[PDB]
Amino acid sequence: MGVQVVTLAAGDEATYPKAGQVAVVHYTGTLADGKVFDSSRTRGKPFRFTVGRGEVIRGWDEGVAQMSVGQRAKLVCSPDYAYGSRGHPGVIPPNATLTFDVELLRVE
Predict the structure, then answer these.
(1) Is 47 a catalytic site residue?
(2) Structural domains of the chain, ranges and CATH numbers in brackets
(3) In this structure, which of 21, 62, 90, 102 has its CB flanked by the most CB atoms within 10 Å?
């Protein structure tokens, strides 16, 4: 399954980011061995992207769309939904399942 979204904390179950809408999130991404490759929480500033535009990996475009505002979830992105066999040199290895702890802050 490309992406699975497991809830850590419920959102308002009302406000979901739709295609072409901006989602504002905090996130922390980890590899299967626990290594943190990216976090907006560490940087201390939320991250914005436009849902469905391919600005992020496919697991995010599809997974964040399943979240409602205030929700915290783990997005488990299979390699086909992230970087595939190619990976991202110096950041992500080949064939990596990526886990993101994401909180959806706002839709714009």
Answers:
(1) no
(2) 1-108 (3.10.50.40)
(3) 102
